[PDB]
Each structure stands twice: as structure tokens, then as C-alpha cells.
Amino acid sequence: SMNPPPPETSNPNKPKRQTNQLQYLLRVVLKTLWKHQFAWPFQQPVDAVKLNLPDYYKIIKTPMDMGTIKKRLENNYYWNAQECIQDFNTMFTNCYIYNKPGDDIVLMAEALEKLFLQKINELPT
Ligand SMILES: Cc1noc(C)c1-c1ccc2c(c1)nc(CCc1ccccc1)n2CCN1CCOCC1
Ligand SMILES: [K+]
DSSP: OOOOOOOOOOOTTSOOOOOHHHHHIIIIIIHHHHTSTTOGGGSSOOOTTTTTOTTHHHHOSSOOOHHHHHHHHHTTOOSSHHHHHHHHHHHHHHHHHHSOTTOHHHHHHHHHHHHHHHHHTTOOO
């Protein structure tokens, strides 16, 4: 089979707000990870057709990526900062579920996760 539609990035039924935390998550946390040497494979949904991963969406039923997170931030999709942190954790955990220890892509996820945790540590109050 092919790819699912990507995660929703807009909900017109959801109220919106801007906050110091949500702004930092886009401008500091997401920007930093995005510009990292290992970011590209995480900048859009996993495309199982192009990567030839016919079991990807059999194993992964809650896909997430930084392209989606970026759009969710830009669209003010997130009301709670926790929702965004969750999405970043889902993204890493997926990489660890599907792939094997020591795989290039696992090593890249580990580095991005380490940096994420360094940046989240400085979330403003
Ligand atoms: C994340 C993730 N979780 O599970 C897998 C598998 C990946 C994964 C794992 C690896 C990923 C990748 C995603 N995206 C790319 C680069 C973008 C791309 C390139 C070609 C076709 C579609 C997208 N790569 C690198 C793919 N190249 C293929 C050619 O050999 C070197 C690596
Ligand atoms: K509103």
C-alpha cells in the first residue's frame, strides 16, 4: 500500500492562543532541530513508497515528523505546549520502534533527541 494522509495541521473548531512557550518551541526548539545536520529525514512524513518500506504503516500507526510539528506551530494548532513536546517524543519513539539499534537513522534520532532535551530544558515559564 501507499502512504496515509499526513497528520492534521489545522483544526478550525479549536480555539487558538499565542504564548511565550509556544513561540519558543517554534523559534528556538523547532528551528534548532530543523537546521541540524541530521534533520532532513525527519522534515516530512516518512514516505514508504519512495523509501520502499512496505511494512512501515503496518508497524507505525501514530506517525509524526517535524514538517507536521512546524506547520502545527505556524497554524497555532497547539493550545498546550505539552501537545508539541508529545509530538516530538512520538517522532523519536517511532524511529526506535521501526528500526534497529545502531542503524544510521537511529543514531540521527538519538542526536536530535539529545539536542531537543537540551532545548526543552530552557523552555521559558
Ligand atoms: C525517519 C525514519 N523512520 O524510519 C525510517 C526508515 C526513516 C528514514 C530513514 C532514512 C531516510 C528517511 C527516513 N528520509 C530520508 C531522506 C529523504 C528521502 C530520500 C529518498 C526518498 C524519500 C525521502 N532518508 C535517507 C534515505 N537514503 C536512501 C538512499 O540511501 C541512503 C539513505
Ligand atoms: K479563538
